Every structure is written in C-alpha cells, then in structure tokens.
C-alpha cells in the first residue's frame, strides 16, 4: 500500500548478493559541473520511477573509488546515489558536511533530466566513511528533514551529537586504530538522543578500511536501514529488529538499537 515501496520482496541473501535486483546506470559529474564539491558519479536505477536519493562522502585522502562499490550496490536496491570527490582529499569533517549538502542539491537541481526525473526531492539521506561519516553527523545535526544518516567508521573531534534527530545507524570496526570505536563511534552513539531511531553495529575482525577493504554486512544493513527510513518500508524492519545474531556474530561484534522504531 506504501507509495514508496520498490522492488521484489526481501529474503536474507540477496541483501548479501553482490548485486541487488535493479539494473543500474551511470552519470559522471566532472569538477567543472560541481559547485561546492569535487565531482562524482551518480548511480541510478534504469527502471523509471521516483526513488529516494543518497549522497556518500569518502574520508581523509582516498576518493570516489574508496566508496564506489557501496554507492552502486545501494543503487541496485532502488536508490539514486552519488559518490563524491571532495574539493581536496584533505578536507575536514565540517566541510565534508557542506559538500554532501551541495551534492544532494546537484542531483535534484543540476543533473540531467534522466537523473532528476528519478528523485523524490523530499526523501534524502547521507552516508560517509571516516571524516565523511563525521560530515554526515554534522549535516544530520543541521538538517532534520533528512530521512537517514549512516556514518561508517566515523571520525570527528566533536563527540556530542545530542541534537541529531535523524534516524542514524553507526557502523564501527573493532580493530579500527584510526577512528577507534571507544573514542569515536561509541561516544557518538551514546550522545544521540534515546528517543530517536538509532542503531550501532560493530564489525568483528574489521579494520578502519572495511567500508573499503570490505563486504556483505555493511551492504545489507545499510540497505535495510535506508529502506526502512527513506522508503518507509516496514518489510525491512525484521532485519533490524531485534537484529538477532544479525548478519552474523563474528562477522558481528555487537548490535544496539532503539528497536522497534515506531512500527
């Protein structure tokens, strides 16, 4: 009955499948066309419909390529997704927040008609790796119209995110020596209010680079999160709640949440 539901009905593995069921196409954004960010690649479903849109930022150094696999596996589940380059690869979290904002406004207002015709302007999300994840917490903390935020192994100097009201899934890595869970991801999770939809999923046997030396767990729970909150798709609730032993214990360290998230 939901206006926003897309795609065949979910089984568990399949979210683990490398590829989702939507065929995907490409739009390349050069630096020349990108006002307030460094360019990027838009991945979008071939099948014509209206879909939520997502912007994804890299971290300190790296690239576009850092996060590509992720943006296009997400698009293959029925989303319009831009993976960006930043103005410089040394840009700090707060600027990456600005650049995420500019990247969303590019897809809705500046891209080809083929891209813009596929986006529902009202249903947006942000994700990012490392400093890019910090940038998404900042953007989330200033745009409570965003439908979801997914910080991946996030890094930020500010640990207090107690003004974020956007549904936020934080993904941490146990072996991360760069943005350690103890002093980044966990403090961020705890600071988020108790009364919003939030979750913390910690990978087991995972470095800082898993969101780029990766695979099936992030893809699965991120798509499930985006489906639930960007698409209002209650069919994905049961992947998230209880989140039982989840995409798997020893692939999964641990999993906190405020389930069930207003069924």
Residues 6+ positions from 154 with CB-CB distance below 8 Å: 128, 130, 133, 134, 136, 137, 170, 179, 184, 185, 188
For 116, counting Cβ atoms within 10 Å of its Cβ (0-12 exposed, 13-18 middle, 19+ buried), the class is middle
Method: X-ray
Catalytic one among 57, 66, 76, 130? 130
Per the annotation, binding residues for poly(ethylene terephthalate) are 60, 131, 155
* Strands 51-57 and 119-129, bridge-based pairing: parallel
For the question of residue 208 being annotated catalytic, the response is yes
CA distance 134 to 245: 27
Domains and CATH numbers, the chain: 1-263 (3.40.50.1820)
C-alpha–C-alpha distance, residues 235 and 232, integer Å: 9
Strands of the 198-203 sheet, one edge to the other: 24-29, 40-45, 80-84, 51-57, 119-129, 148-152, 168-173, 198-203, 252-257
For residue 252, give the H/E element and its range: strand 252-257
Out of 85, 91, 176, 246, which one is annotated catalytic? 176
From 77, 208, 231, 246, the catalytic residue = 208
130 is a catalytic site residue: yes
Strand, helix or coil for residue 221: helix
- Give the integer Cα–Cα distance in Å for 259 and 74: 23
DSSP H helical ranges for the chain: 64-75, 93-109, 113-116, 131-140, 185-191, 216-230, 237-240
Rounded Cα gap, residues 201 and 224, in angstroms: 13
**Residue among 149, 143, 249 at smallest CA distance from 189:** 149
Nearest-angstrom CA–CA distance, 199 and 147: 15
Q: Is 94 a catalytic residue?
A: no
Closest CA to 102 of 130, 152, 143, 68: 143
Question: How far is 175 from 42, CA to CA, in rounded Å?
Answer: 31
Q: How far apart are the C-alpha atoms of 15 and 85, rounded to whole Å?
A: 27
The widest CA-to-CA distance across the chain, in whole angstroms, is 47
Binding residues, as ranges, are 60, 131, 155
Q: How far apart are CA 144 and CA 163, in angstroms?
A: 9
For residue 57, the 8-state DSSP code is: E
């Amino acid at each position: 009955a939901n206006p926003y539901e897309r795609g065949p009905n979910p089984t568990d593995a399949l979210l683990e499948a490398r590829s989702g069921p939507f065929s995907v196409s490409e739009e390349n954004v050069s630096r020349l066309s990108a006002s307030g960010f460094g360019g990027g690649t838009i991945y979008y479903p071939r099948e014509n419909n209206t879909y939520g849109a997502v912007a994804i930022s890299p971290g300190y150094t790296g690239t576009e390529a850092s996060i590509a696999w992720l943006g296009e596996r997400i698009a293959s589940h029925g989303f319009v997704v831009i993976t960006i380059d930043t103005i410089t690869t040394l840009d700090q979290p707060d600027s990456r927040a600005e650049q995420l904002n500019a990247a969303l406004n590019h897809m809705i207002n500046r891209a080809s008609s083929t891209v813009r015709s596929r986006i529902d302007s009202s249903r947006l999300a942000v994700m990012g790796h490392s400093m890019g994840g910090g940038g998404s917490l900042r953007l989330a903390s200033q745009r409570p119209d965003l439908k979801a935020a997914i910080p991946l192994t996030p890094w930020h100097l500010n640990k207090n995110w107690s003004s974020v009201t956007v549904p936020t899934l934080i993904i941490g890595a146990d072996l991360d020596t760069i943005a350690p869970v103890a002093t980044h991801a966990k403090p961020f999770y705890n600071s988020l209010p108790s009364s919003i939809s939030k979750a913390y999923l910690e990978l087991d046997g995972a470095t800082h680079f898993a969101p780029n030396i990766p695979n099936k767990i992030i893809g699965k729970y991120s798509v499930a999160w985006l489906k639930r909150f960007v698409d209002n798709d209650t069919r994905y609730t049961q992947f998230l709640c209880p989140g039982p032993r989840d995409g798997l214990f020893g692939e999964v360290e641990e999993y906190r949440s405020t389930c069930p998230f207003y069924p």
